[PDB]
Design a protein around this nucleic acid. Structure first.
Ligand SMILES: [Zn+2]
Ligand SMILES: [Zn+2]
Ligand SMILES: [Zn+2]
Ligand SMILES: [Zn+2]
Ligand SMILES: [Zn+2]
Ligand SMILES: [Zn+2]
Ligand SMILES: [Zn+2]
Ligand SMILES: [Zn+2]
Lengths: 82, 445, 76, 78, 90, 89, 95, 96, 103, 93, 105, 97, 83
DNA sequence: ATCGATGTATATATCTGACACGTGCCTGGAGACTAGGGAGTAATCCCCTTGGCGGTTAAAACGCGGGGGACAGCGCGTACGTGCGTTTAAGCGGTGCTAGAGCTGTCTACGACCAATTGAGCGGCCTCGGCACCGGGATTCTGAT
DNA sequence: ATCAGAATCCCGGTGCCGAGGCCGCTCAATTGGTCGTAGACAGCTCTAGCACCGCTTAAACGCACGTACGCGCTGTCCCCCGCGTTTTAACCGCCAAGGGGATTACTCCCTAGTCTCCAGGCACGTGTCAGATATATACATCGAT
């Protein structure tokens, strides 16, 4: 082996909880979507959903209005919109 | 049966709140992790430190990670007793003593709303069996065969579903009238197909309001006469942009509506003069769709290559400054920015000398996956699309019928007729005369 | 100024247009070179169909633009 | 005979048309007009019946006679 | 040691990772289907193309009738486009 | 030694080659519908086995999916990673 | 007994399609039958006259369309032409 | 006692609201038979034929009365005259 | 049959037979009877719609010839078409001139 | 190409009636159009009568009743007399 | 006599009338006495019209017949005027009719 | 100087125009009006002179009949001068709309 | 080329002569507009009919037979042009 | 009444272009014989038409009177009739030619005819409820004060 | 402005017969198949519709001046309308009676068809005088005296 990898590149005791501070400042990261190609060939305000056809539509139905509500919009509709 | 090991920990409140708090943080880490440290911290084993040696599971209580191929994380449960591991590839929970994932508990699947979990079980409900996909036809009230086909692809459009189910328009609309705004009428249709009207003439009331609204702006597109389907597409998507600027609280070229943020692209034109090859003045023109000719062609790549094929201007007055001579430059169209969903229109019509027109009934080959690396303006990586919608027309240039073909989650295709909804194989739709195509973003390398 | 219009066969043409002109002017310019009646001609620019009675300067159409000439396909 | 169309019938027919005041010779005028019209229509019907090689005038004969004169009437099996 | 031996292990590491990714997502989706819907049945597939997803033929038109909300009249399906051109223009 | 395979994987992500080899692997398989064929296999497994056991299904599909990877997809990626390993060895 | 033809069933079906809770008498039925027969014979005469003027022994849909456009006023003829074209489309879709 | 003109308008309204035949059937049938006796003798007649004849005659008389009333109104008068009927039949093209 | 193939109610076979025996031409096209049946169906549907409206305006369930006469005389295109056509038991429109009205 | 008319026959009739009177081309075309219109009217009347009587053929009786219904009293009577005389002369030969 | 027109003693072509009746799609079968009857009727009508036209032309001291003579002849008779009440003749003109009320005293 | 009384020249012109049969309307303006009216239904059309002459003759005959009916109505109205209401009444009695 | 203002081609003396032929003695000044309107309506009707007959014939030139047929259908049969 | 003048009817030379007549050739009309299906005729049934009788009742007929409507007669001032100067658009003689009307050769795909059949369309019955009839009260005009 | 007096609409109740559904019925539209030609298509030929100009000229336009009648107003005579009283035959319901319209089966004869052959009528060309055109002359007729 060549020591060039050891010079400047360089069971453990680290934990996955140590990356909590670093996870609170980086934007949404995708699996097979490169971020460099986004600003290079796509629009900055373009909505992106990775593999939308993998699972069916996850939603719930209200009891009073019966509106199909997204998971993130459940609490907002029940307060001042139901 | 339900996993009894995860049911035993459910008996305690603080223990159940503790495991539900860490998975929401664990899933928040995987969504905001750099790919470099992702393999070194979330996909690196603790015993052999092999990268992606099977399913790498992160520990629930500590920072140990073990591989699947050598039972390194399984030994962590056989020695310490941690049988609940989260796979860094999908974020699911696996049980070792049950040898199976936990995919029958909506609590862990909706752990992001665990703080209000007591309310969702009372005021909300799960969708029904027959209305879990919204598969329902639209009764043809006349010559509306072209209208119902355009709405069918928008019903199963994942970008339109997320925008409609989020209640963005309803919470920001000023008039909130279904018989006046197009967005308010579309929300009634998705509520009639995906939900249930409180409390067979069923699942068809919301479609009537769309005819009433369209009659107030343009009575010609009210379905009473046979019209073009592509003209109806650009008509309805423009009114959604007009209703968004109306709901604004108070200058910018690019809009923030659901159409401008999804289907809006930009073209690039170059006029290459053969004098010094320093041309030209770049002009960027946005677009929403692409019209491609199919004359003397058989594949989808052949029609797209002709669009990117260079052409020489023969009726263009030109005066260059590089070579300083009147020359016939070369015109070339390039793609500057690609939209998330690419729609392609095929000109299945030709012009004759006597003024009449003829429909092009030549079959055009098209694959389920389309690579767009050979049509970029400014090497390039691999960019792949996926076909999700096919609109087929059968008839003449002034008389025919429209039948749409759309695919839903799971890779299952369907035949979307006026009042006949039925399944169909994947190889059958690849042989029909496709008039409109729908390609969404899948993967960028 | 001069702009570009894509025909049905994929070939592009050039027409001398002024910003103060309306769409009724270019509908005649395409006719004297092709003979296609203007009622069947559909002019699409930036995904928006050009309406009658409006100039090109209102649609933010600039110099050396590219238009799209397509026809109708009725059904029902 | 021709006096079957009395004064009150003509007065009612004029009231239906909107006439407010009637003269004294209008009765004889409408009598003559109706006589001429009935003569023409009956001549047409009799010609049709004689060509039909029958002795009884039917409703179809009157319908054809009215259609010939540009007076097509609906409601009699025409 | 050889070069080709280690490359096979590297490829085998990425192969099992993507294989286990696909099957893990399919087993959980099916697990939720039968749990939430114990009487769930698949859509009917017609090899001839004469039945819908429920195994029924296309109903005749206009055998059905729609109740209008503007005038309260029970107008047929095919005549609905002609009725809307006169009740709404009042 | 056991630390040999760790160093090659360590430098591979540091040099940035580890992400691209994963991108081209998913690219060629998705362009030929290989992901679709393996998804047809798993749904058929639940029909014959009538079980949702992960280890029971994975013991069947994982050895089976190995041979359906065509030699055209294999010979290209191995040829490309040899250009990447010999950069340091 | 003579098995004569009529149009009561079709007129009643159309009436029930456009007005479910509405009856009709026999006099109105005879009037509608006579009107239908008159329109039919008028359109047939116009088609025959056009065929004889054009020296053609075939009556296609174009002659009928031109005849109904000439015989009926503008909007009514346009609506009838649209209905006829829709019927021809529905007939040519299947077989 | 009512003033002249009110009963006339009342009868006009009552006869415009009604649809029955203001002429009895037996004298009209006798007149039709007497007229038809000249063209041919020993002829039979159906009831529907007589009804259609009466309907057509009443319609023609109503139309002629309306035209005469219009002509008399244009003539700056209120009472109809035989000259109005003559002018109406001349303009209609029926009279030679 | 053939009427179901076009989604109509009028019989196509009877119209085709009447066109064959009508001696209007030598041969008869295939699309002419369907077009004629569609035109006749639209016409009778319009007439029946107007008659039903006129009957609902008078609070009745069965259509009388007076309703037909009123519906025909109230329209402009139908009055222009059926100008030289008379209807039995039809009646006249309730029209009164302005000059005949009192002070 | 070829084109048929009734110029020579009307000319012969005129010479048999007025042997010293000419005729212009416009009057000839007017007479031709009048003859064609009368022929069309009589043929249509005969067809209507044959269809009303449910007959597949047309005899001299249909033409007789048609000219009776079309022409006024004296003219129709004279035409019927002339037609009967011509039919008798043709049958005797 | 070889021609049917000479056997009946007429001037109009019986064969042409028979061919026009058989080709005019008026009926299925055609009789034998109908063409002779029609030719005789047409001959009588044309003879009457030509008599009136010759009289009108002799009243104007002219050798040929102009459409004005035909217009005068049709407008002077009563039966022909009733038969051609809806027929317009080109270059015919109007009748020299002046009302008595417009004449001065 | 000599001066005729009103009404003599009118009767003289009436007799002169009732004797002659020439076309009172000239060719070019009527032809241009017909072409302008026909331009609205379909552009790029060609017409024969015989059709234009027939249309002119028919229009002149119709106008002559309408003027005769208007004169009859004006005479019945105990007047001499014709008014638009006379033409309106003539078209109402004729059944023209 | 588009035509315009050809409706004014019917001058006052033309309508004057047309009224003199009909026997009119005194004419008012408000008859010209009504005559022009009636003539325009009649011309529009006959031109629509002729254009329809010509379009059914799949031709681009209007002959005299089309005008004759249009006049015959409107009850205005005209002689002197054949047919 | 008489006189002037003004457009109108009529005689006469004459030039010409539309009308009358000779000629050739082609195809639609004339001769002759046959099959076969529509039509005239003998016979029979019944129901659709014609004729007569009893009553009673709304419509028809005759007379009073009267007031509003039809009609004769005068004022007038404005819109139409008539004539003259101005010119402007209408009308005749050719000018070039090309897009569209018209005739011809060629292939075929759409329409007519035919055998079986069966089910959608037609004749007969039947009950009822939407409609016809009637009595009573409230409602809405109308004329004299 | 007010109010007594008829006219008329609406409500409630009672009664009835035509229509929508029904059952049995049967015959013409439907299906599969074949053979035939009117019509679509492409190609070539010709011809008159249209812009063009140039020149000539009668009719359209504007302006002055005069006049007579459509309308308005007044007044004056009279004749249909409203009402009351007397007459009457239309209609209703019923009962006789017959003969002409509708239906079925028989024969039979005439005409659509096919093959063959010829001259009547078509365009084409050419000669020719009836009437339009222009000039001059006699005159019926209309306005002011
Ligand atoms: Zn809610
Ligand atoms: Zn642990
Ligand atoms: Zn490991
Ligand atoms: Zn377990
Ligand atoms: Zn809204
Ligand atoms: Zn926008
Ligand atoms: Zn250069
Ligand atoms: Zn409504």
């Amino acid at each position: 082996i060549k020591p060039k990898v050891i010079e400047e590149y360089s069971p453990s005791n680290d934990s996955w909880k140590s990356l909590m501070s670093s996870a609170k400042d980086t934007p949404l990261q995708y699996d097979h979507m490169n971020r460099e190609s986004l600003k290079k060939y796509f629009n900055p305000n373009a909505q992106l959903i990775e593999d939308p056809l993998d699972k069916p539509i996850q939603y719930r139905v209200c009891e009073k209005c019966g509106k199909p509500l997204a998971l993130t919009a459940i609490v907002d509709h029940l307060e001042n919109h139901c | 049966s339900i996993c009894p090991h995860i049911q035993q920990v459910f008996q305690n409140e603080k223990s159940k709140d503790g495991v539900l708090k860490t998975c929401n943080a664990a899933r928040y880490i995987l969504n905001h992790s750099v790919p470099k440290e992702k393999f070194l911290n979330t996909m690196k084993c603790g015993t052999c430190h092999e990268i992606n040696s099977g399913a790498t599971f992160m520990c629930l209580q500590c920072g140990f990670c073990g591989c699947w191929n050598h039972s390194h994380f399984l030994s962590h449960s056989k020695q310490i007793g941690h049988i609940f591991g989260i796979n860094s590839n999908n974020g699911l929970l696996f049980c070792f003593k049950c040898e199976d994932y936990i995919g029958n508990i909506d609590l862990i699947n909706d752990a992001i709303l665990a703080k209000y979990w007591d309310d969702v079980c009372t005021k909300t409900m799960v969708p029904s069996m027959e209305r879990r996909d919204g598969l329902s036809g639209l009764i043809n009230m006349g010559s509306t065969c072209f209208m119902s086909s355009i709405l069918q692809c928008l019903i199963h459009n994942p970008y339109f579903i997320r925008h409609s189910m989020s209640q963005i328009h309803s919470n920001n609309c000023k008039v909130r009238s279904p018989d006046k705004c197009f967005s308010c009428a579309l929300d009634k249709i998705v509520h009639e197909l995906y939900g249930a009207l409180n409390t067979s003439t069923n699942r068809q009331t919301g479609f009537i309001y769309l005819l009433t609204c369209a009659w107030k702006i343009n009575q010609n597109l009210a379905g009473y006469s046979q019209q073009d389907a592509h003209e109806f597409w650009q008509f309805i998507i423009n009114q959604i942009h007009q209703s968004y600027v109306l709901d604004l609280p108070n200058n910018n070229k690019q809009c923030e509506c659901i159409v401008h943020t999804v289907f809006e692209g930009s073209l690039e034109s170059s006029i290459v003069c053969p004098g010094c090859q320093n041309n030209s003045k770049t002009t960027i023109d946005p677009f929403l769709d692409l019209s491609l000719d199919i004359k003397d062609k058989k594949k989808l790549y052949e029609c797209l290559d002709s669009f990117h094929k260079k052409e020489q201007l023969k009726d263009f007055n030109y005066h260059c400054g590089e070579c300083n001579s009147t020359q016939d430059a070369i015109k070339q169209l390039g793609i500057h920015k690609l939209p998330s969903v690419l729609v392609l229109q095929l000109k299945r019509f030709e012009h004759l000398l006597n003024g009449s027109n003829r429909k092009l009934d030549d079959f055009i080959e098209f694959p389920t996956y389309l690579n767009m690396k050979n049509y970029c303006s400014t090497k390039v990586p691999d960019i792949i699309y996926e076909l999700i919608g096919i609109v087929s027309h059968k008839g003449t240039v002034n008389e025919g019928h429209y039948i749409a073909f759309c695919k839903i989650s799971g890779g299952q295709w369907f035949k979307f007729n006026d009042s006949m909804v039925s399944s169909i194989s994947q190889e059958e739709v690849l042989k029909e005369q496709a008039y409109l195509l729908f390609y969404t973003i899948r993967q960028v390398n | 100024m001069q702009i570009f219009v894509k025909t049905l066969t994929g070939k592009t043409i050039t027409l001398e247009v002024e910003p103060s002109d309306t769409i009724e002017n270019v509908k005649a310019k395409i006719q004297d070179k092709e003979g296609i009646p203007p009622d069947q001609q559909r002019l699409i620019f930036a995904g928006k169909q050009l309406e009658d009675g409006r100039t090109l300067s209102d649609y933010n159409i600039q110099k050396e633009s590219t238009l799209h000439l397509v026809l109708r396909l009725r059904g029902g | 005979n021709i006096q079957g169309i009395t004064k009150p019938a003509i007065r009612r027919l004029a009231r239906r048309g909107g006439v407010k005041r009637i003269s004294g010779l209008i009765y004889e005028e409408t009598r003559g007009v109706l006589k001429v019209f009935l003569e023409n229509v009956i001549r047409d019907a009799v010609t049709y019946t004689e060509h039909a090689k029958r002795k009884t005038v039917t409703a179809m004969d009157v319908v054809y006679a009215l259609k010939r004169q540009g007076r097509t009437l609906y409601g009699f099996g025409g | 040691i050889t070069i080709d031996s280690i490359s096979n292990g590297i490829l085998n590491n990425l192969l099992t990772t993507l294989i286990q990714d696909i099957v893990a997502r399919e087993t959980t989706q099916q697990q939720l289907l039968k749990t939430r819907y114990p009487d769930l049945r698949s859509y009917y597939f017609d090899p001839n193309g004469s039945l819908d997803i429920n195994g029924l033929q296309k109903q005749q038109e206009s055998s059905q009738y729609i109740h209008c909300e503007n005038c309260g009249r029970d107008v047929s399906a095919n005549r609905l486009a002609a009725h809307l051109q006169r009740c709404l223009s009042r | 030694t056991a630390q040999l395979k760790s160093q090659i994987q360590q430098y591979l992500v540091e040099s940035g080659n580890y992400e691209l080899i994963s991108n081209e692997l998913k690219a060629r398989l998705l362009q030929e519908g290989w992901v679709d064929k393996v998804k047809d296999l798993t749904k058929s497994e639940m029909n014959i086995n009538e079980s949702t056991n992960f280890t029971q299904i994975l013991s069947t599909v994982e050895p089976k999916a190995l041979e359906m990877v065509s030699d055209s997809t294999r010979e290209t990626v191995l040829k490309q990673i040899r250009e990447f390993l010999e950069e340091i060895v | 007994k003579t098995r004569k033809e009529s149009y009561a069933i079709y007129v009643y079906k159309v009436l029930k399609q456009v007005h479910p809770d509405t009856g009709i008498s026999s006099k109105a039925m005879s009037i509608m039958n006579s009107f239908v027969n008159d329109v039919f014979e008028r359109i047939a005469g116009e088609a025959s006259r056009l065929a004889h003027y054009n020296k053609r022994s075939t009556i296609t849909s174009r002659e009928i369309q031109t005849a109904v456009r000439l015989l009926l006023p503008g909007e009514l003829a346009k609506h009838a032409v649209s209905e006829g074209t829709k019927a021809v489309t529905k007939y040519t879709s299947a077989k | 006692r009512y003033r002249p003109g009110t009963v006339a308008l009342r009868e006009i309204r009552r006869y415009q609201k009604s649809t029955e035949l203001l002429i009895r059937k037996l004298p009209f049938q006798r007149l039709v038979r007497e007229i038809a006796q000249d063209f041919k003798t020993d002829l039979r007649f159906q009831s529907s034929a007589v009804m259609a004849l009466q309907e057509a005659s009443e319609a023609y008389l109503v139309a002629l009365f309306e035209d005469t009333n219009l002509c008399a109104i244009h003539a700056k008068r209120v009472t109809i005259m035989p000259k109005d009927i003559q002018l109406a039949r001349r303009i209609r093209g029926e009279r030679a | 049959t053939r009427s179901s193939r076009a989604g109509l109610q009028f019989p196509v076979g009877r119209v085709h037979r009447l066109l064959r025996k009508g001696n209007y031409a030598e041969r008869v096209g295939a699309g002419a009877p369907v077009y004629l049946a569609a035109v006749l169906e639209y016409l009778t549907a319009e007439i029946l719609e107007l008659a039903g409206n006129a009957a609902r305006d008078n609070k009745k369930t069965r259509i009388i010839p007076r309703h037909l006469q009123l519906a025909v005389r109230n329209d402009e295109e139908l009055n222009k078409l059926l100008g030289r056509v008379t209807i039995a038991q039809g009646g006249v429109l309730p029209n009164i001139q302005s000059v005949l009205l009192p002070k």
